[PDB]
Amino acid sequence: GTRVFKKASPNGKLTVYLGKRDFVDHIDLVEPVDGVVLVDPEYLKERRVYVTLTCAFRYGREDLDVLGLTFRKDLFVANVQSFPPAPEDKKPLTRLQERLIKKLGEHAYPFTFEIPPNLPCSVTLQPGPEDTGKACGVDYEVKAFCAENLEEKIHKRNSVRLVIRKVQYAPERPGPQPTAETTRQFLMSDKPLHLEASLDKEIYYHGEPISVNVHVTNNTNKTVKKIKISVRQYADICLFNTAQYKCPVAMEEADDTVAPSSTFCKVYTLTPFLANNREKRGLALDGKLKHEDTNLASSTLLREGANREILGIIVSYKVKVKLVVSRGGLLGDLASSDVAVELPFTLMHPKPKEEPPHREVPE
Amino acid sequence: SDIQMTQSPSSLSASVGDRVTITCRASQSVSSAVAWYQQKPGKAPKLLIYSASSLYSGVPSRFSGSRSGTDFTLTISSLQPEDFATYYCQQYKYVPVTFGQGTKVEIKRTVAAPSVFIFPPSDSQLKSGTASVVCLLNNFYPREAKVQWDNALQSGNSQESVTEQDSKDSTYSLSSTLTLSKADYEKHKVYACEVTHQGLSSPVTKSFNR
């Protein structure tokens, strides 16, 4: 609690102060964004200083050959007139704000932001080499600028922009153990091909291995030629319309075979990590402050409720286990006999004690 | 342009129960990415404080760190026997991470008297072609000392070797081995050693004649 973050407008006329850059979304309460803006009247000439917080979607246009160019469509914008203080307004300060003005004097004006819940968390989509601009995805930013009114074009030199992140961590109590089973019956037998699978637990941390217990019971004429285990990142995206992708981030293709009238049990262990997923442009990642590496995006935790089609990028994970079943049969290979099941789980960082850094050990 | 982490003081003596402060300065700001490590000799370093003030899970609450800009301090409130070791700071904001030189934290003891003995060289050895006379200093405190070996002078041949602080009684021990070629050992058989310690200003020279 001894250090605070600071950033100055280019002409030094504005100076934003914050206690932190990550603000935690415990699903029912996301912690507020409180700071102060330090107005220097030796350079101030501008008659009003506002602070706005924005949550924005950032993308490049597909059909443009203009590298480094991005666009930033807004998702949530708050406005706060910080200078001068407008009466018909008496709010108390935070202890953070209180200590800051004791440190800086009455030239530091507070600003307090409340993030409404059901807003997207900071998520960055993996750039390819053809990406040289700002990181695409959903980013948060507090802006402080001085202008006459909110209509007036504001000047870059008279403003200061500060990226922050809305983030979540693992819940305390793990869910029920992930379990799944399916039973596939073909045309002329009624004796089944049964697939059962399970994960050893419901909550994993980044870098942590995942063990899937597979148990298959073939009571059919068919033989499974391979088993494919894969961890998939599901991303639900919604800006003007909805988009979905399902991207394997770790995968094992075993040549295990399950003969007719057989059983089979094997455990498989996969470990999602970024190093073998660098080619997958658009893969979702945890929010980038500027350009440093971040992990595979943590699962988004939602408040259980009607599907409000939340704007932003909603990330989830499931293990998939597919059995690759021979195609003899009276139908040739015109149709698939494959059998698969999907096991959801939660992939997050644990609740920390110290805040997360901007870079980790820079070079 | 590596970050130099200048620890101070190089060494300090104190006794059980006291408060102690080691300090570490940083060539430039390293934010709060400073760690503190304890290492008892012959053993792998052990982690005490990360993030400049955070106690490492398992560490006794008697250790604390703090930061004032580029100056970083570890302090132990109630010194204890388990806590006698060397201590390094580390900055990990920038590659490469860089440690400090160390600060030696010894026990302050009531001055103790060096039991000085001299060991003429074995007959099994001057048979082999060189001589080595060993002056021993035993179970004494404080560890500074000077051994002065035809009973006039010599230099460039001795090599001292000290031990660490004994666990129970906090005493040091020391050895000084003057080496010589069998040829020279037989000419001017007039050597001895003189010990100069706090526990006795009146030196106590043991001698051998051959």
């Binding site: 250090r3 600071k6 950033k7 480094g68 666009f71 202890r95 200590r99 440190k103 601009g133 | -």
Partner: peptide
């Protein structure tokens, strides 16, 4: 009109820290 942005963010730190006295 959806506002454009151009070019990478600066590699050097643009954001600094300051001391705050404990209460």
């Amino acid at each position: 009109r959806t506002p454009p942005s151009l070019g990478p963010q600066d590699e050097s730190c643009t954001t600094a820290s300051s001391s705050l006295a404990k209460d």
